Amino acid sequence: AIDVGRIAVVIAGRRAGQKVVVVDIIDKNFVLVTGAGLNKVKRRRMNIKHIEPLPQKIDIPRGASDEEVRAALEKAGISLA
Amino acid sequence: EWKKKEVEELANLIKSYPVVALVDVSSMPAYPLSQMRRLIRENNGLLRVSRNTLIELAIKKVAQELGKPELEKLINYIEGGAGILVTTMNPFKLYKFLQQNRQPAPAKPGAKVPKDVVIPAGPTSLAPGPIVGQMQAMGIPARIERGKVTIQKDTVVLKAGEEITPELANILNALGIQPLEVGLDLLAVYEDGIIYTPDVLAIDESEYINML
């Protein structure tokens, strides 16, 4: 599994919490997670910190920022979780 | 064997002569072709090299007006173990010239025969011996007359698409019959805006008078 725009959650990382989305895939061993700062998500590197996919999928660009990663995340309705 | 040194030398060459042909130098020796290659010099032409640089009739065409290259043309007639033959000789002469000069070509044991192979009737000039026995075995009837071994009649020993058994090949070879071609088989000839194929180029002039 794990492709871009597939919405995620974790039990580890900064918080944790918390729901996060894969916005770019760094290497074959690292992924870049970000989210809205409305859920107190910030950009960070991860390398499987229990990253488990949710059923949800949305469309974001390959290399993006939270106003365009915000915008799809919103209409899905998961910026409040 | 520099790129654009070697193509360049072919470049000037193709432009130099009215007639450019692609020929299968493959079927040959080396005795047929090295003698052919000398022959070709004596008969106002020369034969040449190059690997992708053979398909590169394109630069020469681009340099002039025509429609011999890869581009405008039909389907680059080029085949494996092809060579390029540039000459003053007319394409029909070129094809006939290639056909006459050749020696010789036996059919090879276990090989697929390119065309029907025939024997002519007459005495072999060979003495009686096991050789008679051999002819009968291959499918050629024979007898002793005038003290010599003779082939009874004309016959097609094998048809085209059929393999030649080794026994048949050896006997045919003994007889000095050489049905196969190991001259240069001509893939195609370009002259003055037209590409001529081997089927067009093969004219049996006498056959046309017979047909009528």
């Binding site: 916005v23 770019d24 760094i26 074959k28 920022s65 | -």
Partner: protein, 77 residues
């Protein structure tokens, strides 16, 4: 929003002999590259990261690489 493939240039001394390396890894900051390079080199060549000398680290564009292997990998990210 930032990825970039970071072209590390350096040398390591092992047994008084000098190996070149250009190790291109993508992260988003130089600190990832530094940890990653000390770890990769040090694991495999069997050498500490106090005998690793980094000459340089230069980010180049991540639609580029100057190895076949790195570029081909990064085409999809």
């Amino acid at each position: 929003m930032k990825v970039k493939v970071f072209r590390v240039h350096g040398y390591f001394e092992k047994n008084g002999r000098k190996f070149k390396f250009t190790k291109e890894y993508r992260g988003i900051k130089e600190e990832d590259v530094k940890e990653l390079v000390y770890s990769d080199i040090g694991s495999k060549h069997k050498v500490k990261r106090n005998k690793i000398f980094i000459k340089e680290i230069k980010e180049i564009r991540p639609e580029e690489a100057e190895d076949i292997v790195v570029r081909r990998l990064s085409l999809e990210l």
